[model samples]
Target: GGRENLYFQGMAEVLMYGLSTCPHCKRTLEFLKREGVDFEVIWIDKLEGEERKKVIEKVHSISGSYSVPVVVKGDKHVLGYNEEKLKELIRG
Candidate 1:
């Protein structure tokens, strides 16, 4: 099977990690807004030392990676903003 073909077969639960100054993060946020994807956003940059540490800790506990734009749909997760993957996950 194709690599991108593996997608979630249920609800799309998104956990976004981004800094406002980051262009890529902004793009992802904008796309989520435009697409109207029901999600919960975690603004990492806006968070302070402890808050940021807490998110980082959870992320590490889950995926062991610090990549932003992480989308967790049940047991499945995407480390970055993959548009096609998002669509497939939501559609399936």
Candidate 2:
């Protein structure tokens, strides 16, 4: 009924693709940490060559924008920095 119920599902993995210097990205990362959600970050700005291209392609495919702070969970995704949405996605 609460976080106790939501916390046990270890399969929930959050992937965030963002630039190294994006404030929104940093905020998103901070929120995730504050909420105790597990996440991985792909710093697109630091990437180079084919890796950057591939990440950009994937980010576009999911979010339909070149926006940073893109959060992904399987087929579910959110663009920009939306706290409640991120909370919902992480809890579920």
Candidate 3:
């Protein structure tokens, strides 16, 4: 399914919080698509004023740090962009 927040639903188990111009994020995006992993991507910087602040705070809570390219799956999360770790998170 496609919708706001979720652009595709092939791999609903994953969620990614990243910036629009982040190179690491770019790599992650390409990798995810190539691997057919379903995930929601939020370009934090593109969010509206207050809403953006809230989301950034939420990401910090999950990651326990301020970093770009935060990817999460259920109770687990990966900070920064690590292709190897991202690959492990997806079932397919």
Candidate 4:
């Protein structure tokens, strides 16, 4: 029951786009874990070449700030952990 809403449909590759050492990232991960959400994290710390550039460009445009925990749900995206916005993304 809980798993259906938390994870993406028929896919196991939700991107937790964030810095590994960031507190906000930790918080987001904690929330997801507690909620039983299944996801894989992409650490922005040591990313280089095309990978780093691509991540920065994509997330920067949406967030207007290259901070941690930019959770990407397929085509859906969100910047930070405002409860309402997060809930809205998950609920969708």
Best-fitting candidate, scored by lDDT: 2
Q: Model 3, 1-92: lDDT tens per residue?
A: 33334322224578788899999988887877888766778888788887688778878888999887888888787887787787777752
Model 4 lDDT per residue over 1-92, tens place: 23232222325445577887888888887777766666767677768887677767766765677776887766677787655666666666
For candidate 2, what is the total of clashing residue pairs? Answer: 0
lDDT of 3 at 24: 90
Backbone clashes counted, model 1 = 0
TM-score of each predicted structure versus truth: 0.70, 0.82, 0.81, 0.67
Q: Report lDDT (Cα) of residue 12, candidate 4.
A: 45
Better of 1 and 4 by TM-score: 1
Q: Candidate 3: where are CA atoms >4 Å away?
A: 1-12
Best by TM-score: 2
Off by over 4 Å in 4: 1-13, 61-64
The residue pairs found clashing in candidate 3 are 11-38
Q: Order of candidates by TM-score, top first? A: 2, 3, 1, 4
For all the candidates, what are their Cα RMSDs to the real structure? 10.0, 9.1, 4.6, 7.9
**7-92: candidate 2 lDDT, tens digit per residue:** 11224478888897999999998987898767778788887897678778878888899888888887798899998898877887
Model 1 lDDT, residue 11, Cα: 32
- Two-way lDDT contest, 1 vs 3, winner: 3
